[PDB]
Amino acid sequence: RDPKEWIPRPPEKYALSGHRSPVTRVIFHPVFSVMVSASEDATIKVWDYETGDFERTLKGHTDSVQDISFDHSGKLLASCSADMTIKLWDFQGFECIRTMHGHDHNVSSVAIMPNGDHIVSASRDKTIKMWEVQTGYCVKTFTGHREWVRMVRPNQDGTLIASCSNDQTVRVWVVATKECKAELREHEHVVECISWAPESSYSSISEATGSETKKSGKPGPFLLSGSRDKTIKMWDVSTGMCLMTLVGHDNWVRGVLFHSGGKFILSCADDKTLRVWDYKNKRCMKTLNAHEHFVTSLDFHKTAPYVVTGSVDQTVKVWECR
Amino acid sequence: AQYNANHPDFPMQIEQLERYIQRYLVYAILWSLSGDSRLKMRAELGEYIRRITTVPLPTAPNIPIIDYEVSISGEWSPWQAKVPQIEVETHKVAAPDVVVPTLDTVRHEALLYTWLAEHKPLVLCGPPGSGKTMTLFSALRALPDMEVVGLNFSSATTPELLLKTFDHYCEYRRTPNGVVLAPVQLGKWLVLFCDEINLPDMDKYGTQRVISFIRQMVEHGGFYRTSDQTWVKLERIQFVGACNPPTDPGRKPLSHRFLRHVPVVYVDYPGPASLTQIYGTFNRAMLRLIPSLRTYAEPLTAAMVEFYTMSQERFTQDTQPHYIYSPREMTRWVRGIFEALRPLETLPVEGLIRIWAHEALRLFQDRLVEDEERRWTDENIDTVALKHFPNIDREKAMSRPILYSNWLSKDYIPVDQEELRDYVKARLKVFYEEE
Amino acid sequence: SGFLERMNTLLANGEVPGLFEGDEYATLMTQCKEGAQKEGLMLDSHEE
Amino acid sequence: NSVSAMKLSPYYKVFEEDALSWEDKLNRIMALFDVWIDVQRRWVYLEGIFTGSADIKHLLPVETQRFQSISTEFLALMKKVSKSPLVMDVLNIQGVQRSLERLADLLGKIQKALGEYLERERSSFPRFYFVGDEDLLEIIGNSKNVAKLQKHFKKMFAGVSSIILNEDNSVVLGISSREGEEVMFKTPVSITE
Amino acid sequence: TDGLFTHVLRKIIDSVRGELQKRQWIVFDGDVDPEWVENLNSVLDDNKLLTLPNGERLSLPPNVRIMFEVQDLKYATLATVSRCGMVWFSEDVLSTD
């Protein structure tokens, strides 16, 4: 097992199935060896991926839960549901310590800042809102999108937050001054998912795309935007140019992310497959028939060689990597 | 005069001028007295001229004179020498721009160029899809000093439709001789292409206002500005018309007073031989994507031509108004197959037939009204395919639920009904909570 | 019937000559410049 | 000034038409060339930025392509001026007036879009921090033409009003102050190397 | 972005249309208070420089003269008075005749 090169394999490890509704998203706990998944039955079930044993359900949401996230310490879980509410969970006690209102429609994303003192969320009211962890007050609103904003994700340092909306555009914002750094629009259809480039991949991205080394030394933040036109595009936030376009998915791309080692791209779509991409050569090695229905999301563990993929068939699967 | 310009050292001599004019005059008479008639009538006029004239004529026993142009040297030369068997590039197969040369095409393009060079108004008459718009646009490519503007006439068309175009593409300027209308640009002649001139309805007294308006602009070189009752003179403006035959439903015959200024050229439907040549070239270029399928170009073209012929005669405007079939359908037929073959790196012969059959249904069956016609199309598609493509898997290519979609794959591939139903049901669930 | 007339020209040509006049035509030229710059090409004349 | 004296002349009445005609041409010459000299100057020190810098294309891709579109049409306009360099013909150019106004506007838009490039360029030479953006663009753009750089050394040095160069203007021989005092470099600096 | 006085001085310094070869005079016709006139301390001193917040420094050409036309100096500080040569125009200079 190469410590930065493992990829998932067709033989699944565990097939966890307790949800009564399609699984929306699946995430890994940064510290503990435990798994958290959110579904459309207003439940957030927590699983252990080493033994595949269900532990507990985090209920309290009225309607379907759309996104969940963890802070850096793993002590807080931020969940957003379609009931216009954002709930903050004390993970040690497994209770809802704060409920956040203010969105005028369905909330489809949520994330905790790397500093851990602020929460960013995006909803169907065409706004991206920011909240305080301590007080639960809305402090900033990022307007400018013309349609439903589906996902919002911050960069490594938390200074920039990216958002993808139904307006077929991907916008990068500056948290400090709320300005739109760039408007990345090349997808011909609605963009579903976004993902940033980890620090271990800037050199690989620069040498793979043929981009010359910059005098500053920083190649610039790189963004991925999977959309429903069955294409995956990698962008240069600094320059606003689409570095490459990945083709090969048979349906709408629902999730995309980098390998922890920054060597491959993992992406799941509605074609019932999970695909591993080589951005070095702009081609796909392995296609995994993950589920019997649409694949809603995927996540890649930072250290352990495990991949989790949610699906509409109400099944959460854990993949060994070899 | 152009010949003398090209030959400054050797001006054209009288005996060459005498020969050239005499051949041209006979060539001019045939195209001026029978250009608005069928091919049979054109041949009949040529026979009558041959029986009475003394000008030297082509010696071909059966080729009509209309197939011979007049060379600048002063000798008859067949039109067949200017229609070479070209090879279209694969990426421009059945494109709107590309025109396959044909005997009728070159004759009309030269005739269209002659009238257009004089800025003389002209009207192309023929059934829809026969090539009236194409031939004119092809001729305008030989005249870089002209800009074409497309106007579509309807039953409610009235002269202000021409007026609003004038403000957009021309400007009114004050001159000492009066108000003169000219295009905003300089040096190019504006050509107003009126696609359906004969639909504008007559009043109860049998007069079309726009036709009289066009007649006024061409005979008197201008019109009247109704805002200030000021005469306006047209400059660098040309009129070109297109229309279906007046006997077609909804069409009205044009006024005789309008017809004197406007020669009419008849563009009939291409014959089976012409259609085979035109779409055989398209098929050969299109089928170069799959080298293993290049041997099927001829049977594919014959099948496309044959089924188009049977469909055209079976369904006519008598039953339903929209039962109009033209080469446009076959152009869409080639486009449909070419798009379905671009992403595929290989395909068996049965797969090509399935795509060929799929496009036939989407073009000739979607507009049929009752089930009897649809069943007729289904049966005859199989018979045509079997007749031109023997010894192939019938069931593999003629599976009745012929469904093609790019929903379940990155490319346009056949999709089974059951998987398609499941996917649409899953999509509908998302469609409910989104839209 | 005028509803169909505008539709008839729009279908075949993709543009209605008698739609944008006066300020509307002047206004249209603004985002036409703005739209062209966004997609990359630079155009200045009203005809292009 | 000469024609204005004709305006007060009592005999101007028999030459109202022609003298007034020259005023229309003379004033239009002034209007055409007042923007021309500026537009020419901007293009001179903007092309040096976009040609002498290799990293500007990757760091500033969107507006670099815009400059080449501006540059080529400026070259196209200047080329046909070279074809007919008569003052009346270039004045009688179809749309010569508006063509320079968009040139002034487009070059201005490009110039305002270089702010972050010049700020980073100041790190290479520390003394560039005491030079305005307009002057710094002139300094970097006109590096090849060192003749016009003599007016900027006073803003970067305490007493170096101007430098002393060889006939080829390729090797720095010394420096000069505002009073004419000169310092002869022991080892002259070559710009070619 | 340059102000009114800076733009006038910068054009003279640039001398695109031969400004330096002329006699340029800048007259400040109005009231003088330390809010704006103290910004000319370096201009009116031996430095002869107009220092801007952006770090740009504009040397005063030898052919330009800074002029003030004022009716009173009840608000001007000692720094402004000491940096300029005073020419007193009593009302008796311009008689009724």
Ligand SMILES: Nc1ncnc2c1ncn2[C@@H]1O[C@H](COP(=O)(O)OP(=O)(O)O)[C@@H](O)[C@H]1O
């Ligand atoms: N020689 C030819 N080469 C290529 N295409 C042809 C040829 N003859 C006919 N066609 C097809 O016939 C169609 C003519 O349609 P069009 O000219 O638009 O009809 P109309 O002039 O009645 O509107 C075109 O789409 C063209 O593809």
